[PDB]
Amino acid sequence: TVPTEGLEVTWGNNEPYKYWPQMSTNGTAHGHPHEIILYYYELYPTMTVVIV
């Protein structure tokens, strides 16, 4: 799993690798109300439930 801050991986005698995450979703921020909520749920899961 790749956290927010990143991951570092070392394999044998080679140099280490670095990975960072990027935004993606299947919802949309424009359109019907039920599609808007899915957009923010998949990006900030814990804060969406509390506020709503």
Binding site: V2, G6, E8, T10, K18, Y19, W20, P21, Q22, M23, S24, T25, A29, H30, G31, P33, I36
Partner: protein, 439 residues
Amino acid sequence: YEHVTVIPNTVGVPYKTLVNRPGYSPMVLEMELQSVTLEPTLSLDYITCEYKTVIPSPYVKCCGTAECKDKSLPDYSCKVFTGVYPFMWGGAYCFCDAENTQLSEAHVEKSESCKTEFASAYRAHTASASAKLRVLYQGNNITVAAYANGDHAVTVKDAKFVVGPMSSAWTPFDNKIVVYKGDVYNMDYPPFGAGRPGQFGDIQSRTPESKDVYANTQLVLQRPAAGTVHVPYSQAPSGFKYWLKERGASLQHTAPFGCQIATNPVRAVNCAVGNIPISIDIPDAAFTRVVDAPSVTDMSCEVPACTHSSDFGGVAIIKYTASKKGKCAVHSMTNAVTIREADVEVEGNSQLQISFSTALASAEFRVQVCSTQVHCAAACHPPKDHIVNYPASHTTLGVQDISTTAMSWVQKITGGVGLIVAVAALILIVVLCVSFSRH
């Protein structure tokens, strides 16, 4: 003119600042960090290595009794045995069939190879810091190098820079460390003069050239077998060899915040904590008056594409009308949007093109070009790739950043509910007033 700014402690991300002085045209500088180094102060305690055992020839004395005396050598031992009858290749050694004795002795020294294979124990104290920068200054790249505290000043091309101090005192080293051929460990080594028979620290010395040695290995002599000449003994094996086979992982592979470790001299490089303030003094000959710079009178904005990825995923087009040929600066007036270009060339009646990156779902921002402002707005789409190999180039979002369509829905629901409360309360007030008067 004096200017002060603050820069976060991240390597590989450029930053920009604005200089504004009344009566003159504005100026924009670009700064980027390349390396930060920390270095502690060290003191030596003692060193360790492998050992050697010395056994001289036995003494077989026949038809008599022998004795031995005491000495001052480390781990000295003596014993006398009775009832021996040794043999050799041609027959028995001595005539008597009893009343024979044997004497044996041994002691411990320091091996010769301690001048190549050894480990060193240190004591650590507070560390210093250093830094190195690249600055874009009047169309050229210059480099500066200075200590990260307020007691150093450097001058390059008639400009003076002062950097530091840092905002945090975090360090990855403890009070006690151990070093061996490029690896650094955190360990609580035993006190000098208090070693143990089978662990790290059975042999101790103060310097590879010194003559004093402390040893705490067990050594007991045992009885010779019948018909043989030899000197057997029992002893705990070396502790330095055992440590090499089970020492575990080093500090480079376990340290937090992504620091790197080197040993000659001991350093830690590129730790991402805190932020660094910077101060710069600019002379008067570097400025340009307002009347000599060109003026721009009519503007409009259009945004044909936007995608809020971690790279520069935007493009914009601006139209302008200029008075005469010259140079100008470009700067953004909002914190959530970054613009790559620093300056442009304007002439006649034409257009110019720029690029930007942002994290907003709905983009609204203002752009300033030589003392005038314009308004841009567009809608943005999300990307398709999940994982990339470089950090973001824009800042994070707050609670107030919400798409325009979502903000509209909140207003209708909130406003409508408030009306039902408002109308109900007026009924209560009127009905209470009539009852008060009627009585």
